[PDB]
Design a protein around this nucleic acid. Sequence first.
RNA 1: UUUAGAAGGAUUGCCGUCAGGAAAUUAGGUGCGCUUAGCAGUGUACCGCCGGAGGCGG
Length: 173
Amino acid sequence: MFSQILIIKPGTGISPNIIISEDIFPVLHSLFVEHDKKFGITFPAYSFDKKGHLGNIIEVLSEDKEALASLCLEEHLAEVTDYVKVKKEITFTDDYVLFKRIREENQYETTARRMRKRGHTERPLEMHIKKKNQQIFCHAYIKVKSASTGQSYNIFLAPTDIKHGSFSAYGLL
RNA sequence: UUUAGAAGGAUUGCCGUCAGGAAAUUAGGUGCGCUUAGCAGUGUACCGCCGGAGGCGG
């Protein structure tokens, strides 16, 4: 489907990850919440070696050649331009590896509270947190702040093989 | 197709008593260490929700 490719300009001091997290996410999520129809996000350079990176490059994907123009890409990112360039041609294509959202247990105290009142009252838990968190953590992230809960959380990512489907507000499957 | 082919070494035991190492000394003059440099995988993994382990929202 149609797509608009996003560079971060390289060799500027700041890392890709920081620039991607702070700039691109907030404005894309605000635009995504606004224009309700679920768009999609793909990273053309995922390269999991022992841990997993995210690359210089991201792709916004959608299935309407005018919906991308309804997002007004190159005029929204008009402050931080020195670190981001937004190409302006919504070219269709049929090659991509879509991504999803992996989750990660939660700290022992926050599980406990639910773990007691919910019932199922009173070391087996700690093994579950340690194993489940240790397995996942070695993937990529995109630190996220909050508008409501006003909290800091990290949204991990991982590939999949669906090649079509229905997406979410942040951008994954 | 090998100087081929073969093989049970084994039982037992009290090393002991005594003793002065000791007197003398000069290690000494010299000395060029010295050019360069960006520390981090995002600096962390937060509240809840289903639900008898496995999931999903922000």
